[PDB]
């Protein structure tokens with residue numbers, strides 16, 4: 001469209017690689033299958049990917065969690081993956097890492113949209129929402145010693161292109177979205193949260209809770225088989241899992257698409 005310039009690999013490099021960030025390497029590609037895929041294939045080849053950033057202008061076979069698939073239109077989103085060395089950390093709290101990316105995405109964009117912050121938060125465990133619409137999705141995938149973190153931020157996507165519940169920074173009150181300034185600020189907020197995660201900083205758990213749309217509301221979790229538990233989400237436990245109050249007693253749950261029911 002008219003509002004979708006391409007990126008600048010050079011600018012990003014100079015702002016981030018060694019200078020204003022801890023990231024070691026940065027590549028923009030015009031088209032791949034899945035940025036997660038590429039960084040996994042690359043680690044399985046023997047390459048160290050701790051610190052590597054991969055950004056794509058367009059992505060064709062997008063990966064969602066639990067099987068499903070993410071959809072993209074050329075230059076309309078910010079689509080990236082990054083590599084982190086994890087084996088220095090308990091194998092609990094690895095799920096707390098995909099959570100952490102959620103916060104890095106709500107932080108980077110919160111100072112840009114002019115919607116009441118109280119109507120923006122994080123849906124557990126891998127969605128980001130602004131007035132009911134899906135703003136970005138996150139996927140963490142494992143390949144020890146590394147984790148690969150994928151973000152898909154709808155910058156200028158329109159909903160009638162990838163999903164009817166999507167919205168975007170454009171549709172939220174942003175006339176010119178600067179994908180270079182947004183990508184650069186999000187890579188910084190990522191780096192900040194990952195270090196919190198590695199040093200078991202408890203500010204990570206508290207801030208997630210503060211900005212959760214899931215916590216504090218009746219929710220519904222749909223499980224394979226036609227199963228459905230319904231409860232109020234009281235807290236996240238230390239593995240990154242969802243504590244529910246059901247008839248007074250805690251049911252912990254690992255994943256599932258959660259449905260907010262106010």
Ligand SMILES: Nc1ncnc2c1ncn2[C@@H]1O[C@H](Cn2cc(CCCCC[C@@H]3SC[C@@H]4NC(=O)N[C@@H]43)nn2)[C@@H](O)[C@H]1O
Pocket residue numbers: 033034035036037061062063064065066068069070071072079080081126127134135136137138139149150151152154157162163165166167
């Ligand atoms: N553009 C869009 N905007 C709004 N909503 C959308 C949409 N495209 C699909 N959906 C709806 O998402 C549902 C399927 N889903 C979404 C997620 C969340 C995590 C997404 C991971 C993507 C990143 S991108 C960089 C990296 N590289 C990858 O390969 N994967 C990662 N997990 N599963 C399905 O129901 C659809 O309705």
